Amino acid sequence: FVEMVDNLRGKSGQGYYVEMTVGSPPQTLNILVDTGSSNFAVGAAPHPFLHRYYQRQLSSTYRDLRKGVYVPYTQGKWEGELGTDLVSIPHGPNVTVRANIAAITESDKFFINGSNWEGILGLAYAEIARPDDSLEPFFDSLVKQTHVPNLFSLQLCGSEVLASVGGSMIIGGIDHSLYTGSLWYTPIRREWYYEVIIVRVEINGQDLKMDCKEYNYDKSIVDSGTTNLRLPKKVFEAAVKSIKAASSTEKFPDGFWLGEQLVCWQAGTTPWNIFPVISLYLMGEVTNQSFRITILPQQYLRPVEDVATSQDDCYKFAISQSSTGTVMGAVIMEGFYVVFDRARKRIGFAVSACHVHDEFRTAAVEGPFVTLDMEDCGYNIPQTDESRSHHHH
Numbered sequence: 001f002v003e004m005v006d007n008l009r010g011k012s013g014q015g016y017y018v019e020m021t022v023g024s025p026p027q028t029l030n031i032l033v034d035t036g037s038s039n040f041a042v043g044a045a046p047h048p049f050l051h052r053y054y055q056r057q058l059s060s061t062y063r064d065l066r067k068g069v070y071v072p073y074t075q076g077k078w079e080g081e082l083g084t085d086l087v088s089i090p091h092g093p094n095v096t097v098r099a100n101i102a103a104i105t106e107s108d109k110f111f112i113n114g115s116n117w118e119g120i121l122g123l124a125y126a127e128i129a130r131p132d133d134s135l136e137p138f139f140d141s142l143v144k145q146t147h148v149p150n151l152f153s154l155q156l157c158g159s160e161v162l163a164s165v166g167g168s169m170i171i172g173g174i175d176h177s178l179y180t181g182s183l184w185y186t187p188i189r190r191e192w193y194y195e196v197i198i199v200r201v202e203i204n205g206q207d208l209k210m211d212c213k214e215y216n217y218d219k220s221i222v223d224s225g226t227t228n229l230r231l232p233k234k235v236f237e238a239a240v241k242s243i244k245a246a247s248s249t250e251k252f253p254d255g256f257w258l259g260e261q262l263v264c265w266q267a268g269t270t271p272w273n274i275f276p277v278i279s280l281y282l283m284g285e286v287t288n289q290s291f292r293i294t295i296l297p298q299q300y301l302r303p304v305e306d307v308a309t310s311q312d313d314c315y316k317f318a319i320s321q322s323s324t325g326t327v328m329g330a331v332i333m334e335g336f337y338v339v340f341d342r343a344r345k346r347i348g349f350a351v352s353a354c355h356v357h358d359e360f361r362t363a364a365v366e367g368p369f370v371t372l373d374m375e376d377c378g379y380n381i382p383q384t385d386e387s388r389s390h391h392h393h
């Protein structure tokens, strides 16, 4: 899959994007790769943060679906007009497909100044698509219209400008050059988000000793569209307490632990060893088994070059509190080659050939761990009448 290696780019903290073409003749656009959403949506009107947008009028193959879409979320919203057109990935499979495209006509706090992307490729399942699950997501269309296997994999590699990032999205397979050691699989619990189950959390070898349902309250997901490792409130508090304790020789402001303030050391003197490793044990394919993925401070402390002190190495704490469950974001994913094996309803992890580490410690994927009479660690989200009233024909 040499053609697909190194096809992702971006700016630190602002998402990874892949080059895509839309329409006939092909219009090139940079598209955010988001395993936490399910719409293909592209800027389709002028915006201050867009250098370019999808021009429906220039495409002979564009078809209007005569239906709008409105997508509010926590920070803001995007909206626009649904249609279809021909889509390809120049540094992807040698195929062209007709996909749904949401042409974004108005948005608030969606595009990011300087991120260099103009659209989003939602790689999650139909269940969370907008306006509803009958709007076929891009990957579903790709699989149905071509002979591309139902699997993709992601290798995310982590003074005036933000640091550039790179990576690979391999569509249709697994590229063995992108990982080392064993590839371990955890079940996709349900096909909506890429939902998984965490059965144990350790911070420098020490068990947090919480009821494991707390780790997955109210879900745990693998999400390329979130920068941070996000943890449920109770888990976040317990983790921060443990990381604080391990690093106690350094007294950081409260701002740092809230992710609102950088901490610096003189260039190349960062005391990595005072910061603990974090292990998440994921449910194995075998009932009573688990495997652990272990990340370093190199993953959870994000580099940000401060203009005022460009001679310092400065870091943001990239673990944050959630009210919507665990989010294994770029912080987690940058340690690993991550295989989204939709065909077999499972997610694979292996140590990334590009992960950042030091001479003492490495990101690791290790197993099996077996537990006698393993409890159910999954949480069942309370069913609303709204959700229950939906017919799924």
Ligand SMILES: C[C@@]12CCCO[C@H]1[C@]1(COC(N)=N1)c1cc(-c3cccnc3F)ccc1O2
Binding pocket: 013, 014, 015, 016, 032, 034, 035, 036, 037, 071, 073, 110, 120, 223, 224, 225, 226, 227
């Ligand atoms: C797609 C949605 C709209 C619908 C709700 O979800 C949104 C979200 C948030 O989490 C995920 N996974 N996608 C999302 C993330 C980023 C982003 C911002 C910074 C870095 N990386 C990014 F993906 C930008 C836009 C955006 O919009």
Ligand code: NI
Binding pocket: 391, 393
């Ligand atoms: Ni009905």
